[PDB]
Amino acid sequence: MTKTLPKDFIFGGATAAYQAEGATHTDGKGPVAWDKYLEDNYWYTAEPASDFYHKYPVDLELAEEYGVNGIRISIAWSRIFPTGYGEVNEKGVEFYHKLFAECHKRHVEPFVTLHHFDTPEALHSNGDFLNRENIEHFIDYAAFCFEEFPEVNYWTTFNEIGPIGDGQYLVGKFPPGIKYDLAKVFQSHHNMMVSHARAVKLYKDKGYKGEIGVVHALPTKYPYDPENPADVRAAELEDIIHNKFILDATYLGHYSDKTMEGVNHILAENGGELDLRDEDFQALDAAKDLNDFLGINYYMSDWMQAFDGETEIIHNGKGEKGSSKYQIKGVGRRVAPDYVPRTDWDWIIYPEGLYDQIMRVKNDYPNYKKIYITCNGLGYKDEFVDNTVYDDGRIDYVKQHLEVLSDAIADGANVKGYFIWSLMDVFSWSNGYEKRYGLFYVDFDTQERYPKKSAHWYKKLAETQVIE
Ligand X SMILES: O=P(O)(O)OC[C@H]1O[C@@H](O)[C@H](O)[C@@H](O)[C@H]1O
Residues engaged in binding ligand X (CB under 6 A):
16, 19, 159-160, 217, 297, 375, 379, 421, 428-431, 435
Least distance (Å) between residue 116 CB and ligand X: 6
Closest CB to ligand X among 69 and 431? 431
Q: What are phi and psi of 9, to 5 degrees?
A: -80, 145
Closest CA to 190 of 123, 119, 279: 279
Least distance (Å) between residue 427 CB and ligand X: 8
Closest CB to ligand X among 301 and 431? 431
Closest CB to ligand X among 186 and 429? 429
Q: Whole-angstrom Cα distance, residue 100 to residue 97?
A: 5
Neighbours of 317 (CB within 10 A): 19
* CA 265, chain centre distance (Å): 27
Question: Amino acid identity of 105?
Answer: K
Q: What is the DSSP annotation of 299-335?
A: ---EEEE---S--EEE---S--TT--EEEETTTEEE-
Least distance (Å) between residue 299 CB and ligand X: 7
Taking CB positions, which residue lies at the least distance from ligand X? 428
Tell me the chain's radius of gyration from C-alpha atoms.
21
Closest CB to ligand X among 215 and 234? 215
Q: Whole-angstrom Cα distance, residue 33 to residue 50?
A: 19
Closest CB to ligand X among 323 and 465? 323
Least distance (Å) between residue 306 CB and ligand X: 27
| β-sheet with 221-223: strand ranges across | 221-223, 302-305, 332-334, 325-328, 312-314
Closest CB to ligand X among 45 and 126? 45
Helix axes 453-462, 392-410, angle to 10 degrees: 20
Least distance (Å) between residue 457 CB and ligand X: 21
Q: What are phi and psi of 122, to 5 degrees?
A: -45, -40
Least distance (Å) between residue 268 CB and ligand X: 31
**Cα-Cα end-to-end distance for the chain:** 9
Closest CB to ligand X among 297 and 357? 297
Q: Whole-angstrom Cα distance, residue 151 to residue 362?
A: 31
Alpha helices in 180-244 (DSSP H): 182-205, 229-239
Closest CB to ligand X among 109 and 160? 160
Q: Whole-angstrom Cα distance, residue 107 to residue 109?
A: 6
Least distance (Å) between residue 421 CB and ligand X: 6
Least distance (Å) between residue 28 CB and ligand X: 24
Closest CA to 435 of 300, 317, 315, 314: 317
Closest CB to ligand X among 30 and 162? 162
Q: How far is CA 294 from CA 116, 155, 158, in A?
A: 16, 11, 12
Least distance (Å) between residue 295 CB and ligand X: 10
